[PDB]
Each structure stands twice: as structure tokens, then as C-alpha cells.
Design a protein around this ligand. Structure first.
Ligand SMILES: CC(C)(O)c1cnc(N2C[C@@]3(CCC[C@](C)(Cn4cnc5ccc(C#N)cc54)C3)OC2=O)cn1
Lengths: 450, 98, 77, 50, 48
């Protein structure tokens, strides 16, 4: 009770007895008697939270008493124990309060600059928490827009927090900076600045490594992470970035090829956008796993629309049209096979006439097409996650319908095996559903797609 | 019965009239664009890996010397523009020839 | 008004006709494949189906050849 | 004599909390909400309720 | 039953004119702001 009030009001005067008392009774400020039962909060976080005009006169005296009593180390970095604030250190409070002078004064005596604040409170908003800043002191400094603290933390004679360290989730400082990234101007304005600052600094210090090539536990990277989360401000900034300085120009993704009068030909780097099924291209994640609300705008960035158009021209139109023709021919054959069926007799029919051979060929090709539709649709549905609302109209309904049609054909085979009356009940439904499904291919033409 | 059925028809007509059309005139474009892109990517994934590599967009341009002087050799994709405002601001650093 | 007539005839009328023909040909094949007894009869039954589209038809004709239920659902759809 | 307080803060996350001493009274002292939803002015109720 | 299903907390705001507690039924809402940095602070819980 007493000491917490003394430190809480910044009363340096009232700590005269403390130092003689601790030695006299063989007691330390980190002993359980002086700490919150609930949270384990020691005197130092209490002092840093109760800041009077940015400066509390008792932090130096508490630190002096702590070293004089023999256990500075155990004092400066004492984590919280309550599940809600687990792992939070006095250094986290110093950085969060935005006082460079106390973070310097606290790290100078051995504050752990790598301790992780991983309690429930410090979790992504989607996982029951109000602030996720990367779970690390340097990530905390970068994510709350304090460039001076980042510059100090990375470069100081006592202990340096390197930029490549990953937290429990695997998120590096750049995944953390993407996580807080928002599409408001007030946010992106500093998110992009801090991102570029940290990237260039890490490149200059450690030349061989690329900070942006460190993946988290999910296998994503800062750009690939901003692709599937819906962050335009940083996504397009990463795509279009160009570094003029010759020292670190290699870490740019848009170059200027040539010029002549008012004609400038530049060229974008697609090292990650288009990878050809080798390294989890950004484009696939943007078109499948992205956020539906903002996908339309992610797909309009400068080098992506032209890339998609080029790919359509190169191999997209011919394959789609060849697909349309093949499907229409297959359905014409299906209709012809259905029409010629002799309704008199219980199957299986004896195939002896050349017309009967033609009918058997139609029957078998129908089953081949049905099992093909089953095969490729099931592969697609397993490959892609189950969609919800606002994504059904894109593609979901068509794979649903194709599955239903394939199932109908398969059951038609079983019935046709033995039961004369049964199989005709739904084989016609098969034709109806197939001609309904032929509407799928109108998406190639915009006028028909709408 | 008949009058109320007509009223339901009229009400449905109005609802399709204003709320549906005002939103559609904008949403249809984007939904079609998404469908087009996803079909393109599906067609890509259908082909085998080597064929995809053969039909790979972009050039094999070399950007410059690396930290040790080695060449970059990055697959890029060029776009060009016409600008009449900023005159001779910077220059093409790579080809140094149109 | 002349511009309106021209654009209505050319732009979207053929589009609607294409879709309408698609569904019509699919249903023609589906409907006539079920019947048990031929190109002449196909024409008569296609004309009968068109008559049902306009609002007059023969009930016994639809139920003439088996599975009345599936015919009813098909026509309703 | 204020009706909106600032509970806590952490970085860019400010949790404040409004006083509903009169808005919601549970049928004891003629809550403001019932009067706003029944007896209010129809023209501007849509905006009072936001 | 309405009293049992009453929205809001039983938060205490501060000492009154005579030091007695306020104990006013409040209702919390939270926001994210990136423009005004450390402008004022939470006076009540003094802990998230
Ligand atoms: C005639 C023939 C044999 O060429 C053919 C081809 N495709 C189908 N469809 C089309 C479809 C419809 C629903 C979306 C699907 C699953 C997306 N989807 C998944 N894999 C793909 C490969 C290419 C394309 C294109 N263009 C689309 C793809 C495709 O499901 C089928 O079975 C039917 N018949």
C-alpha cells in the first residue's frame, strides 16, 4: 500500500527509509510482498504509468536502490503474469508512453530489448484483443509512429534490437507494420514512410540479407500479406517503389527502361506477382484468398491489369473458346444420344447394329464427360476454400450446379444398369441442368457476362 | 386475391426498379472482372509447369550489377507512357537507347 | 424514336434471342427425348410446345406419354 | 457534471464510456429513449436516433 | 427482469464533492485514431 502510493504520486522525498529498510530486513523490491497479486506489477511500471508532465522523479531513485540492493537485472525486466497482459515489460510502457528519455535511461542499465508482450490484450482485433503491434519493443516503436525511438533502438552502444527478429507468430517488423496498416491517409502516410526507412536501414547494415524475404509462420511476406488482407496504401507502394540512391537501388521494383522526348518506357518487376506455380505467386492469393470488398481495387494496380490482359491475349482467349466449342459439341452429342434411345425394352440393350454402336459410343462419352466434370470440379472445390456471401455469384454457384449434374449422370448410370423405369426419371434433368450450365461460358464476353 | 397479387407484382417491379438497378450499374462491372480474372488463372493452372514457363509473360531484362557486381537478371514487364509536363526529368538508365 | 427502334432491334434483341434459343433448344431436346413412339413428329411436338408457350394447348398431349409429373415440373420451370 | 468519460488508452486505441443515467432507466424515471422513440418529432427522429 | 438485463457497467467515475463515489451506470465505446497522438489520457482505469 504505502510504497505504491509513494511511487504513484512521484514523491521522491518519501523514499528515505526504503534503502536502509531493504538491507536491514534482507528484502528486495522484486520480492512477492511488493507486487500486485493479480498482475505482478512491480514499482517500476507503476511509476512509468503515473507520469507527471512526462517526468517522474522516482525512476532514477528506484533504479539506484535496485542496483545498490544487488539485483538490477531481475528488476528492470519483470514481466506481468495476468493472462490479459502477459509478458509486458517496463520497456514496453516506456516506449508506449512516447518518452525517449526514459527508454534510453531504462535500456542503458540492461533492459531486455527483445521481450515479447503476448498477453490476450496484445492480440489481433479478430482474436480478442485491442492492439497488435508485432509483439516486440522495436515493433511497438515502429507501429506507433516514433521514428526517433526506432533509430535509437537499432543503434545504441549498449544493446541493439536487430530488425530481422521474428515474434511468436513469425511476423517480422514489416508484417507487423502491414498488420496495423489502414487505408486512411493519416495511417498510410506514416506506414509507408516507416516501412521504407526500416527496409533501407536493414539493407545497409546487413547487405546480403533481404528483410522482405523473411516469411512468417503462415508462409506469407509483407507484400503477399498486404495482398490477402486488403491494404492498398502499402500494397501499391511496395509494387511501385523505386530507390534512386545507387547504394541500395537493387531493392526497387519499378525501373525506367528508356526515354525519347515525351515517351518514357519503364518496366515493373514481377519476381513475385507471376511465378508460374513455384513460389506461391501474389496474383493467385489476390484473386482467390483476398478480401472481397477491396479485390476490385487491388486488381486495378498499374502492372496487374496489363499483366492479366497480356496473359489473356497470349493463351487465354484460344483456350477458353476451345473449351466452349468442346462443351457445346459434347452436349450436342448428349442430346443426340438421348433422342435416339429406343423407349421399348428394358436395358441393357443388345448393341449389334452400327447405330447401336454409335449409341454406345454416345453413352460412354457421356459418362467420360460426367466423370471429368466430377474430377475437375472436385479438384477445384478441394483446392479452394468454401466461399460465403458476396462470393457465390463469382464462381460458387457454377461448381455447385456442375456437381449436381455430374451426380445426376452417375445415378443415371446405376439405374440404367438394372431398373428400366427408374433411369429415365432424372436423365432428362441431366440435359436440362447441362443446358442451364452452358450459361457459364458467357463470362468471356463482357456483354453476355453482365 | 387478384388485386393483392397485382400489388405484389407492382411492388416487386418497384424494388427491382430502384434498389437493384442503382447498385447493379456499378457492381456488375466488378463482378465480371473478378470472374474473368479467376477464369484466366484457372486456365493457367490447368497447363503443366513447363508449358507455363514457356508461356511466361515479361522479358529477361538485366537491371544492373549486384552488391558483388553479378547481374540481376530479373523477369520484368514493360509499360510505356507519354508525358508532356515534366520535361527531361531523369532518364532511362537501362537500355540507353529506345 | 428512330434511334431507339434501331438500337433496340440490333443491340440487345439478338442477345435475348440467343439466350432464349439456348433454353428453347435445350428444352426441346430434353422434352422430346422422353417421349416414346420421326422428324415429322418432332415438328408437330415442337409446334405444340410453342402453342403452350403462347397460352393454349392440350392437357392430354402433355400427359399422353408417361411421367406426367416430370412434364409438369419441366413446364413450370 | 459531465456525461462522457475516457476510460483508458493504449497507443491509437481510446476506450471512452458514455453516461446513460437518463437514457436507459428501466421504467423508473421516464427514460429519454422512450420519449425519443414515441413522443419525438417525426421529421427528425431518424437523426436523433443516430 | 429489466433490471437484470440492464445494459452498461457499474463503473465508478470518481470522488464526489464530499469524496463519495459516483457509481454511475455507463456504457463503453472504443475507437482507433492515428491523428492526435497521446492527446489526453484515460483517467479512470489507468490500465487497458
Ligand atoms: C468441354 C471441356 C471438357 O473442355 C470442359 C471444360 N471445363 C468444364 N468445366 C467448367 C467448370 C465450371 C465451373 C468452374 C470451373 C470448375 C473452373 N475451372 C476449374 N478448372 C478449370 C479449367 C479450365 C477452365 C476454363 N476455361 C475453368 C476451370 C470450370 O467446371 C467444369 O468442369 C467442362 N467441360
Amino acid at each position: 500500500p504505502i510504497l505504491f502510493d509513494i511511487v504513484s504520486r512521484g514523491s521522491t522525498a518519501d523514499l528515505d527509509g526504503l534503502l536502509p529498510f531493504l538491507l536491514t530486513h534482507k528484502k528486495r523490491l522484486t520480492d512477492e510482498e511488493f507486487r500486485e497479486p493479480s498482475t505482478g506489477k512491480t514499482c517500476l511500471p507503476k511509476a512509468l504509468l503515473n507520469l507527471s508532465n512526462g517526468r517522474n522523479d522516482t525512476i532514477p531513485v528506484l533504479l539506484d536502490i535496485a542496483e545498490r540492493t544487488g539485483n538490477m537485472r531481475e528488476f528492470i525486466n519483470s514481466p506481468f503474469r495476468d493472462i490479459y497482459y502477459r509478458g509486458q515489460t517496463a520497456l514496453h510502457i516506456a516506449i508506449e508512453r512516447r518518452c525517449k528519455h526514459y527508454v534510453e535511461l531504462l535500456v542503458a542499465q540492461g533492459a531486455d530489448v527483445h521481450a515479447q508482450a503476448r498477453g490476450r490484450f496484445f492480440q489481433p482485433k479478430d482474436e480478442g484483443g485491442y492492439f497488435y503491434f508485432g509483439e516486440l519493443p522495436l515493433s511497438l516503436a515502429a507501429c506507433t509512429n516514433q521514428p526517433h525511438i526506432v533509430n535509437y533502438l537499432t543503434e545504441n552502444p549498449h544493446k541493439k534490437a536487430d530488425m530481422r527478429r521474428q515474434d511468436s507468430r513469425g511476423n517480422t517488423v514489416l508484417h507487423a507494420l502491414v498488420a496495423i496498416a489502414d487505408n486512411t491517409r493519416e495511417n498510410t502516410k506514416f506506414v509507408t514512410k516507416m516501412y521504407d526507412l526500416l527496409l533501407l536501414k536493414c539493407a545497409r547494415l546487413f547487405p546480403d540479407s533481404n528483410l522482405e524475404a523473411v516469411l512468417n509462420n503462415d508462409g506469407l511476406s509483407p507484400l503477399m500479406m498486404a495482398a490477402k488482407t486488403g491494404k492498398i496504401g502499402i500494397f501499391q507502394h511496395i509494387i511501385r517503389r523505386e530507390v534512386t540512391d545507387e547504394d541500395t537501388r537493387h531493392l526497387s521494383r519499378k525501373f525506367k527502361d528508356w526515354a525519347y522526348g515525351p515517351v518514357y518506357s519503364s518496366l515493373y518487376d514481377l519476381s513475385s506477382l507471376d511465378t508460374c506455380g513455384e513460389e506461391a505467386s501474389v496474383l493467385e492469393i489476390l484473386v482467390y484468398n483476398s478480401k472481397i470488398e477491396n479485390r476490385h481495387e487491388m486488381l486495378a494496380v498499374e502492372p496487374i491489369n496489363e499483366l492479366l490482359r497480356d496473359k489473356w491475349r497470349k493463351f487465354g482467349a484460344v483456350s477458353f473458346y476451345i473449351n466452349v466449342v468442346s462443351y457445346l459439341c459434347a452436349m450436342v452429342i448428349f442430346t443426340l444420344t438421348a433422342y435416339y434411345q429406343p423407349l421399348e425394352g428394358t436395358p441393357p440393350y443388345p448393341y449389334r447394329t452400327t447405330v447401336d454402336y454409335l449409341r454406345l459410343a454416345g453413352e460412354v462419352i457421356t459418362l467420360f464427360t460426367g466423370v471429368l466434370f466430377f474430377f475437375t470440379n472436385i479438384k477445384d472445390l478441394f483446392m479452394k476454400k468454401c466461399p460465403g456471401v458476396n462470393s457465390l455469384f463469382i464462381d460458387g454457384s457454377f461448381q455447385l450446379l456442375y456437381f449436381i449434374y455430374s451426380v445426376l449422370v452417375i445415378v443415371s448410370a446405376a439405374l440404367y444398369l438394372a431398373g428400366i423405369e427408374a433411369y429415365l426419371a432424372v436423365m432428362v434433368f441431366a440435359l436440362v441442368l447441362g443446358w442451364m450450365n452452358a450459361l457459364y461460358f458467357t463470362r468471356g464476353l463482357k456483354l453476355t457476362g453482365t | 386475391y387478384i388485386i393483392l397479387t397485382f400489388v405484389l407484382l407492382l411492388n416487386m417491379l418497384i424494388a427491382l426498379m430502384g434498389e437493384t438497378v442503382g447498385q447493379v450499374s456499378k457492381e456488375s462491372k466488378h463482378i465480371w472482372k473478378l470472374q474473368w480474372a479467376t477464369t484466366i488463372l484457372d486456365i493457367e493452372r490447368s497447363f503443366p509447369v513447363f508449358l507455363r514457363k514457356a508461356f511466361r509473360s515479361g522479358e529477361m531484362v538485366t537491371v544492373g550489377k549486384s552488391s558483388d557486381g553479378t547481374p540481376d537478371r530479373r523477369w520484368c514487364f514493360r509499360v510505356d507512357e507519354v508525358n508532356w509536363s515534366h520535361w527531361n526529368q531523369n532518364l532511362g538508365i537501362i537500355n540507353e537507347d529506345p | 424514336y428512330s434511334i431507339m427502334i434501331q438500337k433496340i432491334l440490333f443491340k440487345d434483341l439478338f442477345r435475348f434471342l440467343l439466350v432464349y434459343l439456348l433454353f428453347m433448344i435445350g428444352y426441346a431436346s430434353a422434352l422430346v427425348s422422353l417421349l416414346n413412339p420421326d422428324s415429322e413428329t418432332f415438328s408437330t411436338f415442337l409446334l405444340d410446345l410453342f402453342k403452350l408457350t403462347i397460352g393454349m394447348g392440350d392437357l392430354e398431349m402433355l400427359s399422353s406419354t408417361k411421367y406426367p409429373v416430370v412434364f409438369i415440373i419441366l413446364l413450370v420451370t
